C-alpha cells in the first residue's frame, strides 16, 4: 500500500539521507536496531510506506545507498542508525568521481549503476504497490549529480508511470566550495527537467541564513543544515504515513502544484523555527505558523519570492487544528499579497492536514511553493557556466571522459529555455 523507495547518491545525498532516516525512525517509533518501541498503533499502521518488515519484529528502510567512494558508506554504517540499513543495499565504487559529472554519468557511474538497478528492482518487487521514488543528492559534484541523474533516467525508463521526486541541493555562489559546480549543475538540471516529476530546490546558503538569522545558531554544522532538509522531507509524506482531516499524498500535491509539465521546481519551507531563548515569547497557533511559512526568510532556496509570482503553493499542516482557521489564514494571505500570485490560477493555495504532529511540537507546517523567482537561481548558475565555457576552461577533463562540447551547448540552451518559460508565466 503506497510504498516509497528511497535513493541516496554521493556524499551530501547520503548524509542528508541518514538524517532523514533518523528522524523518520524516531517518528515511527523505530530504534537503532530496527525494533518498534513506540506507543501508538498509528505509528505502525502505515510503517510499510518506508520500511520492509524482516524476521523477528524488525523493520528495515526501503533505502538504497550509492556512492563512487566507500568512505561515505563507512561513515553511514558507523553512524547512529547505521546498523538499521540492509547491508546488500549499500552499492559503492572504489575510485570516486573527482567532481566530474562525466565520470559520474558516463564512465565510473555507468559501470556502477547496473548493481544499483538490480537492487532497486528487487526493492520494487518487494513492495506491494510502489507509488514512486525519492532521490537525495547535490547537482554540483560528480556522483550525486552525474551518477544520480543517470540513475533517475534508468528508473524512469523502467517505471514511467511512477512518481519521481528529488531533493536536490544546488550550488550557490556565496557558499561556492568547488570550481566546476556551474558545469555539473547545468548538465544535471537539464536532465532533471525531462525526467523528474517534482524537484525540491534546497540551497545551502538559504539553510545557513535560516540557522544564523532565525535559529540564532552561532556555529551551524552540516548536520544542523541537514536536519532542516530532513524535516521538510518528512513533511511532504506525512499524509501517506498518518491519518488526517484532509489528506494529500505525492501525486495529489503534484497535480495541484504543477500546471505545466516543466514547472516542477519547488522552493520548500518549514515552520515553526525558533531560538531556544525566543521560544517562550511566542504563540503556538495557526496564524503564526502561516505567517512564518510565507516569509521569504523561511524559504530554503536563495530566491526572493517578491521578485516573482507564485504559480501555486501547497501547505501541509501537522497537529490538531481548526480547518476554518486554516482556510481563513490561507485566503487572507492570497488577498493581502494579491500581487505575488499569478491572477489566472484562482485559489493559488492547496491545503492538507495530518492529525499527528512531529515530536516536540503540537503543531507544524511544511510549505511547497512553485515561484517564478526560482529563475534567479538558474540565471546565476547559467552566468557562471558562461564565464567558464566562453574560455573552454576545465573542459579538457570532461572531454577525457568521452564528453563533447556540443553537450555543453545543449544543456545551456535547455536551461535558458526553462528560464524563459518561467519568465513567460511570470509576466
Amino acid at each position: 500500500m503506497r510504498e516509497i523507495v528511497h535513493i541516496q547518491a554521493g556524499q551530501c545525498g547520503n548524509q542528508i539521507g541518514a538524517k532523514f532516516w533518523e528522524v523518520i525512525s524516531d517518528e515511527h517509533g523505530i530504534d537503532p536496531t530496527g525494533s518498534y518501541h513506540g506507543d501508538s498503533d498509528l505509528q505502525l499502521e502505515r510503517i510499510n510506506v518506508y520500511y520492509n518488515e524482516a524476521a523477528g519484529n524488525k523493520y528495515v528502510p526501503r533505502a538504497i545507498l550509492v556512492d563512487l567512494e566507500p568512505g561515505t558508506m563507512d561513515s553511514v554504517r558507523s553512524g547512529p542508525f547505521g546498523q538499521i540499513f540492509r547491508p546488500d543495499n549499500f552499492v559503492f565504487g572504489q575510485s570516486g568521481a573527482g567532481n566530474n559529472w562525466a565520470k559520474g554519468h558516463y564512465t565510473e557511474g555507468a559501470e556502477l549503476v547496473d548493481s544499483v538497478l538490480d537492487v532497486v528492482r528487487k526493492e520494487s518487487e518487494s513492495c506491494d504497490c510502489l507509488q514512486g521514488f525519492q532521490l537525495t543528492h547535490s547537482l554540483g559534484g560528480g556522483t550525486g549529480s552525474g551518477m544520480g541523474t543517470l540513475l533517475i533516467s534508468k528508473i524512469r525508463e523502467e517505471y514511467p508511470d511512477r512518481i519521481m521526486n528529488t531533493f536536490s541541493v544546488v550550488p550557490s555562489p556565496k557558499v561556492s566550495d568547488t570550481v566546476v559546480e556551474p558545469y555539473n549543475a547545468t548538465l544535471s538540471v537539464h536532465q532533471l527537467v525531462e525526467n523528474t516529476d517534482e524537484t525540491y530546490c534546497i540551497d545551502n546558503e538559504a539553510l545557513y541564513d535560516i540557522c544564523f538569522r532565525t535559529l540564532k545558531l552561532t556555529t551551524p554544522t552540516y548536520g544542523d543544515l541537514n536536519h532542516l532538509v530532513s524535516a521538510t522531507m518528512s513533511g511532504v509524506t506525512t499524509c501517506l504515513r498518518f491519518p488526517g482531516q484532509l489528506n494529500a499524498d505525492l501525486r495529489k500535491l503534484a497535480v495541484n502544484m504543477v500546471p505545466f509539465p516543466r514547472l516542477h521546481f519547488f522552493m520548500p519551507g518549514f515552520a515553526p523555527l525558533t531560538s531556544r531563548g525566543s521560544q517562550q515569547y511566542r504563540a503556538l497557533t495557526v496564524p503564526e505558523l502561516t505567517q512564518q511559512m510565507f516569509d521569504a526568510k523561511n524559504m530554503m532556496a536563495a530566491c526572493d519570492p517578491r521578485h516573482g509570482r507564485y504559480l501555486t503553493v501547497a501547505a501541509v499542516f501537522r497537529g490538531r487544528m481548526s480547518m476554518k482557521e486554516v482556510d481563513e489564514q490561507m485566503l487572507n494571505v492570497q488577498n493581502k499579497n494579491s500581487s505575488y500570485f499569478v491572477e489566472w490560477i484562482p485559489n493559488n493555495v492547496k491545503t492538507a492536514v495530518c492529525d499527528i504532529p512531529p515530536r516536540g511540537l503540537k503543531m507544524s507546517a511544511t510549505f511547497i511553493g512553485n515561484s517564478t523567482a526560482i529563475q534567479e537561481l538558474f540565471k546565476r548558475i547559467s552566468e557562471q557556466f558562461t564565464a567558464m565555457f566562453r574560455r573552454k576552461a576545465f573542459l579538457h577533463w570532461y572531454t577525457g571522459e568521452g564528453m563533447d562540447e556540443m553537450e555543453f551547448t545543449e544543456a545551456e540552451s535547455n536551461m535558458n529555455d526553462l528560464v524563459s518559460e518561467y519568465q513567460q508565466y511570470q509576466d
Binding site: 555562489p173 568547488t178 552540516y222 564565464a387
Partner: protein, 430 residues
C-alpha cells in the same frame, strides 16, 4: 587501499624524503623500526606482525646520501632493496643523469617500482621528489618520468621540485639543468609544485625567528606541505579532496599545471602564544607574498584557481567567510574566466609537529595550492640566465661529451618560451 608511491631522487630528493618519512611515522605512530604499538596503509605496506614498510623508493647515482639512511636511525624502516645506489654521480650534468650514468640504473629502479606497485590494490599515483639543478635530479628524473609515463600511462604523477633561486644559486650550471628538465616535466607530469630555497630561508628567519636556517629546517617545512596534500587520503573530515579531484579543480589547461604552495601558520612557540590564529587570519596570510614558497610577486599576477586545504579544529562556515573576505580584497585578482576559484578541503586532524622542530603546535593549519600567472616570472629570470651562458656556449662541450646534442638545448629553450607565452595568454581579460 588508496596507496601513494613516493620516489626520492638524488641528494635533495633523498633528504626531503627523510623528513617526510620522519613525519609520516610520527603521524601514524610507527616507530623507526617499523613497529606500531587503518589509514596508515596509504603510505605503508604491512608485513606479518608488528612491521610496516614505506611505499617508497630512494634513488641516487652516488652512494653517500643513501648510505646515511642505511647506517642511520631509520635503517630498519626501509628494506635494503628499496634504497638504490650506483657508484658515480651525474656531476651536475643532465646528460650523465638521463643517458651515460642513468641508463645503467633505470631498469632496476623501474623493476622495483613495479614490484612495489603490484603490492598496492588502489594506486592513486606517484609523488616524485627531486631538484631541478642537479644532474641526477634533472637528467635521471626526466628519464624515470618518461618510463613511468610509458609503463603506467594514465596514473597521476605529482612532482615536488626544488627550483633554483634568482640570487641564491649553489652551482654554476643550474640554469642548463633546469631548462632541460622542464621540457620533459611539461609532457610527463600531471601537476608540479615548484619550491625555492631562498623563499624558505626568508620564511625561517622572518616567521620562525631562526638566525641560521639549514636544509634540515627547509625539508621539515616542505614535508608539512606534502602531509597537508595527503591528509585527505590518510584521515577523514568534513570536506575531502582526492588527488584526481584536486587535479580537476586546480588545473584549467593541460600545460598549466604549476600551482604555488603556501603554508599557514608558520610560527615560533613564544611568538604564537600572543597571536590569535583564527581561520580568517590564516586564510588571509595565505594570499600574502611574504609567506610564498617561491620568490615572485602575486600582486603582479592573476589567480586562476586556488585549493585551500584546512586541517584541525575548522568548520565550513568560517572558511566560507574567509573566502568571501578574500573575494573583496582588490589586491588579490582572479581571471575573469573563473567566477569561483576556490576548491576547499577540511580535515579533522590537527598538524602533528616533529620533536625538536622549528614550528609551534597549532589547533588549525592550511595549505593553499594556487595557480597564478606570477610564477612565469621565475621562468623568465631562469631563461635569461640560460640565454647569457648559451650566448658563449659556456660549459656546453661537457654535455656534448656525454651524448647530448646542441639542438636539444635550443629545443628546450623554445619549449619554455612557448610555455611562458601560453601563461601570458591565459592571464589577459576579454
Amino acid at each position: 587501499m588508496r596507496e601513494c608511491i613516493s620516489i626520492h631522487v638524488g641528494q635533495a630528493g633523498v633528504q626531503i624524503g627523510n623528513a617526510c618519512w620522519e613525519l609520516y611515522c610520527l603521524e601514524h605512530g610507527i616507530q623507526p623500526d617499523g613497529q606500531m604499538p587503518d589509514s596508515f596503509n596509504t603510505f605503508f605496506s604491512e608485513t606479518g606482525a608488528g612491521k610496516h614498510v614505506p611505499r617508497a623508493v630512494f634513488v641516487d647515482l652516488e652512494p653517500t646520501v643513501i648510505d646515511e639512511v642505511r647506517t642511520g636511525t631509520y635503517r630498519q624502516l626501509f628494506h635494503p632493496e628499496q634504497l638504490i645506489t650506483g657508484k658515480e654521480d651525474a656531476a651536475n650534468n643532465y646528460a650523465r643523469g638521463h643517458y651515460t650514468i642513468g641508463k645503467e640504473i633505470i631498469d632496476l629502479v623501474l623493476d622495483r617500482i613495479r614490484k612495489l606497485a603490484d603490492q598496492c590494490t588502489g594506486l592513486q599515483g606517484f609523488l616524485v621528489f627531486h631538484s631541478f639543478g642537479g644532474g641526477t635530479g634533472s637528467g635521471f628524473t626526466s628519464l624515470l618520468m618518461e618510463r613511468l609515463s610509458v609503463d603506467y600511462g594514465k596514473k597521476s604523477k605529482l612532482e615536488f621540485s626544488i627550483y633554483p633561486a634568482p640570487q641564491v644559486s649553489t652551482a654554476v650550471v643550474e640554469p642548463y639543468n633546469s631548462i632541460l628538465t622542464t621540457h620533459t616535466t611539461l609532457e610527463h607530469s600531471d601537476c608540479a609544485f615548484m619550491v625555492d630555497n631562498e623563499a624558505i630561508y626568508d620564511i625561517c628567519r622572518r616567521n620562525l625567528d631562526i638566525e641560521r636556517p639549514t636544509y634540515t629546517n627547509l625539508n621539515r617545512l616542505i614535508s608539512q606541505i606534502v602531509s597537508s596534500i595527503t591528509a585527505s587520503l590518510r584521515f577523514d573530515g568534513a570536506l575531502n579532496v582526492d588527488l584526481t579531484e584536486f587535479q580537476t579543480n586546480l588545473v584549467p589547461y593541460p600545460r598549466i599545471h604549476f600551482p604555488l604552495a603556501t603554508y599557514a601558520p608558520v610560527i615560533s612557540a613564544e611568538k604564537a602564544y600572543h597571536e590569535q590564529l583564527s581561520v580568517a587570519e590564516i586564510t588571509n596570510a595565505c594570499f600574502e607574498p611574504a609567506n610564498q614558497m617561491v620568490k615572485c610577486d602575486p600582486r603582479h599576477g592573476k589567480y586562476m584557481a586556488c585549493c585551500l586545504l584546512y586541517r584541525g579544529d575548522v568548520v565550513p562556515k568560517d572558511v566560507n567567510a574567509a573566502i568571501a573576505t578574500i573575494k573583496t580584497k582588490r589586491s588579490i585578482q582572479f581571471v575573469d574566466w573563473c567566477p569561483t576559484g576556490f576548491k576547499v578541503g577540511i580535515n579533522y586532524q590537527p598538524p602533528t609537529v616533529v620533536p625538536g622542530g622549528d614550528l609551534a603546535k597549532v589547533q588549525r593549519a592550511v595549505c593553499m595550492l594556487s595557480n597564478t600567472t606570477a610564477i612565469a616570472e621565475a621562468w623568465a629570470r631562469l631563461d635569461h640566465k640560460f640565454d647569457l651562458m648559451y650566448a658563449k656556449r659556456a660549459f656546453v662541450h661537457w654535455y656534448v661529451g656525454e651524448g647530448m646534442e646542441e639542438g636539444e638545448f635550443s629545443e628546450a629553450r623554445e619549449d619554455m618560451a612557448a610555455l611562458e607565452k601560453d601563461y601570458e595568454e591565459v592571464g589577459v581579460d576579454s
